[PDB]
Design a protein around this ligand. Sequence first.
Ligand SMILES: Cc1cc2c3c(c1C)C(C)(C)C[C@@H](O)N3c1c(nc(O)[nH]c1=O)N2C[C@H](O)[C@H](O)[C@H](O)COP(=O)(O)O
Ligand SMILES: Cc1cc2c3c(c1C)C(C)(C)C[C@@H](O)N3c1c(nc(O)[nH]c1=O)N2C[C@H](O)[C@H](O)[C@H](O)COP(=O)(O)O
Ligand SMILES: [K+]
Ligand SMILES: [K+]
Ligand SMILES: [K+]
Ligand SMILES: [K+]
Ligand SMILES: [K+]
Ligand SMILES: [Mn+2]
Ligand SMILES: [Mn+2]
Lengths: 504, 495
Amino acid sequence: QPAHLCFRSFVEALKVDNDLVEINTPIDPNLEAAAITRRVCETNDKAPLFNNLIGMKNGLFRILGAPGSLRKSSADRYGRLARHLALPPTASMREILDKMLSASDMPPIPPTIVPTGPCKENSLDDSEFDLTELPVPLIHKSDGGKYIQTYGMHIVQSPDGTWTNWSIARAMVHDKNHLTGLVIPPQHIWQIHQMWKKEGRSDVPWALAFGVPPAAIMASSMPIPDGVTEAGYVGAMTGSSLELVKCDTNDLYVPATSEIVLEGTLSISETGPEGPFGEMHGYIFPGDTHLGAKYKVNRITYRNNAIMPMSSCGRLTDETHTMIGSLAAAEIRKLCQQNDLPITDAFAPFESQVTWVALRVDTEKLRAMKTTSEGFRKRVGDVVFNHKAGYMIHRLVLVGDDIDVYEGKDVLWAFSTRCRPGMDETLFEDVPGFWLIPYMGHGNGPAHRGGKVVSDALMPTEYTTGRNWEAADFNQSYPEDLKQKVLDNWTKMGFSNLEHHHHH
Amino acid sequence: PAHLCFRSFVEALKVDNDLVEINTPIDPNLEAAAITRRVCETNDKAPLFNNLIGMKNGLFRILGAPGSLRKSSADRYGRLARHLALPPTASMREILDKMLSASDMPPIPPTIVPTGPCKENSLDDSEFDLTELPVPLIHKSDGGKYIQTYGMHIVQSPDGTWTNWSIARAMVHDKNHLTGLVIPPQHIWQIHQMWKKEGRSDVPWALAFGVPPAAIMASSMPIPDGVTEAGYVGAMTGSSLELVKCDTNDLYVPATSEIVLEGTLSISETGPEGPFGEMHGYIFPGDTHLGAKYKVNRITYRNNAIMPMSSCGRLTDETHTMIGSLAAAEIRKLCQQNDLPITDAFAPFESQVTWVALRVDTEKLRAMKTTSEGFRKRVGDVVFNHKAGYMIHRLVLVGDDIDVYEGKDVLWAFSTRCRPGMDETLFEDVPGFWLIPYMGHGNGPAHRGGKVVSDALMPTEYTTGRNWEAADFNQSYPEDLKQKVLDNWTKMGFS
Ligand SMILES: Cc1cc2c3c(c1C)C(C)(C)C[C@@H](O)N3c1c(nc(O)[nH]c1=O)N2C[C@H](O)[C@H](O)[C@H](O)COP(=O)(O)O
Ligand SMILES: Cc1cc2c3c(c1C)C(C)(C)C[C@@H](O)N3c1c(nc(O)[nH]c1=O)N2C[C@H](O)[C@H](O)[C@H](O)COP(=O)(O)O
Ligand SMILES: [K+]
Ligand SMILES: [K+]
Ligand SMILES: [K+]
Ligand SMILES: [K+]
Ligand SMILES: [K+]
Ligand SMILES: [Mn+2]
Ligand SMILES: [Mn+2]
């Protein structure tokens, strides 16, 4: 099976890339597995595979940490993401995001039902499992529970059957056969939960699949449009129909090679304590438990020697930064272009902790619109901040054609030197705000409203006649023949060059 | 020793394996600057150009990147440390503490010596032509050959009670003139104005290149109005600086200066100046203005004289390491003298030295029983109405958990703890720095406003204390488990 279509092959691909460390000695799921994974994420080291978890029983379970985190080397920085998508390990973020957007204007490819798969190799009914006895990790010391669900895919269907959504939302063990987790607007798991709640007849049929086809977990993290079944979008992106098997206890379909599957119901009535949790912005607030949605587990099915993927999320750099920010920025790029805004590129700089998106403007098309910064800022803000894809982003930085928005240092340079504080920004107080950012939910203002800004790092001539500066850098302040002579004599003179394929 | 003599400083860079000697012919027209620019962009070894095309009777060799960064994290600031008699592993906290140390010490006045190495050679008006010397063209669109990027201007108040040492750019105008920036609120401009109001004579002036490294650090620091830099450097180094009188005026220059120009700064004349590739990383090729005009009457120089050169622009060069860091040092001291609970200040390099992050002693903040709106306003009023705050447009207030010397920690705090609009106070009625592109080439007044105080303190920091832990390796795992993970790291297969 290809690495992008089967988590078990993905684990083998990381091993062949020399991008895996197999830890075969006993590791405690109480903090130790997550501490090692956290250190990996903070240093961009190899992904840890914990083959010997204290408490593993009857093949449940091994843990792969850091499945979507960065590699140390600059050349294959994004190689773990590339391996989710059948891209070369050297793929740029522009190439990864173009791949994730490619299904946007293609016919969906419906999944194929198969009679069985590896995910049916072992099963436990409700009398045979206890979620409190599995080696579920405690990820951060102050977490309000053991977060089993950090990199699995929730599967829920609209009541009329026309929309099946795949998405990542966190969940923790509540008791032997229940989870609690975040089911929040405007997320699709929440939109579908509300349809079931308004019908008022039944709890939501639900499955949670861990170790799904890597291309599916990428779509699970991406805010593709309302009403669009992720499975058909992934089929189109990969050029292949995904193989799905029916759940034993409900009529939902799960990827045939899923490592671990939970089958059950998401309650339309019951809640339970959820959180706190060490989250994407780099914080945990220990005194901070709230009521979350409650999931009932009726059955567990799993592969022989099942592997549970785990995100030890927090400060830079993990799955919450590489996948949440980047895939939101991709969808924002597409939204801008569909609203006839001259945006070529979007990226959420890691330095912003997933809270900014930098929009690269085609200034030739900006010049033809004959507008001003005040008018253009309002127009961009009103599109992005009134769409689901803009929900988690609080600052948009508009930059011209000379800025590579995939390079955080170039975005911070442009922001610091081209955006006059106050005058070149528009504040948005009457838009949905993201409560999870500390300055929102733990801040001086409304938790769920405003706190957003459009910052124009376009210089005045970019709107009229064109760029009227040169960078004071090696590339732009010296002629081509001189630069080539300096590069050709660099090591000869006794300076050193960073080797593209080796340097960190 | 290195901190008292530029020639010994070059020798120290050699011992540190932090110098590349280039003995093949190098063109001062862009090539020396292009090599220096690439050094600064990659944190490579400082280039010493021993063989410039057009060198004339020992004028001159060039040292590039004298105050730029080293590649290794262990000795990142070692080229700065070597200006100040600190170890090459010195932290930015230790460098800035050294630079502030002389603030509450008695000045040590300089010692006058009859002669020194800077007198080894001399050229009167008939003997030199500035247009025939190997002065660098530093960027292809510069409006002139900028001879002056790392020399010290020396001017004195009319009443003789204040002698100022400072860096300001100057370019060759003709055989015996320079043009340069003399701009408020800078001390060269303050002293210029004193002579203008007197109305009687041009300003006696000297420009010394390759001065005692400790003096070029004080030359780039905004020490208070009226304070003679020589006496400040004396107190900081615990020694009296050795100065020699100029041949053609009564100003005193460091005895070991590589190259000295003696003459006058005109109170009446101007000439075209710029454009120049500048500290924010831009040049606007359409952009010549009338600048101050200097007349050179005499050149004295060492045998085998070395001209230091800043090839300034995008990160990282002397304009970032020295201008931002030394301004941030003075702002820290200014805050403490105004009874503000600031422990540390630094201008993150990511901000292109437009931001300063102020680390707050939050125990002292809680005892003040204040709010964000009040505290931001007090901090901005102090810093943005002072010369030391002139070049800084954004102040970021952070609590005790943030290392302000780490740009990644400042950017994290800024991005996660400061709500846009609500947690910020804009300042429009304060002097603004025209050289930042968004000011002089922007949508608003070039010399006014565009400043902000961004409060990245969380609400409980003002009241009861921090109510979070970072979701990081340091804070979300117990000490015994962190130690076990670090002890077993290489044994498990990690690097
Ligand atoms: C990759 C990734 C994404 C998410 C999460 C995580 C990872 C690793 C956690 C580690 C579990 C932390 C948590 O913040 N988490 C998370 C979350 N969205 C939520 O509503 N709730 C969550 O608890 N997203 C983002 C969502 O997956 C995307 O916003 C996606 O677009 C949703 O799909 P849809 O609603 O658009 O179908
Ligand atoms: C280290 C350094 C400092 C400065 C400069 C450079 C270097 C390398 C140039 C490469 C020449 C570029 C130019 O931007 N430049 C420069 C300048 N200040 C000016 O008014 N004008 C200038 O043209 N400063 C900053 C000043 O040296 C400090 O602000 C100092 O505090 C002033 O001294 P004082 O007036 O406080 O005595
Ligand atoms: K999704
Ligand atoms: K602007
Ligand atoms: K000075
Ligand atoms: K106050
Ligand atoms: K704040
Ligand atoms: Mn969806
Ligand atoms: Mn001064």
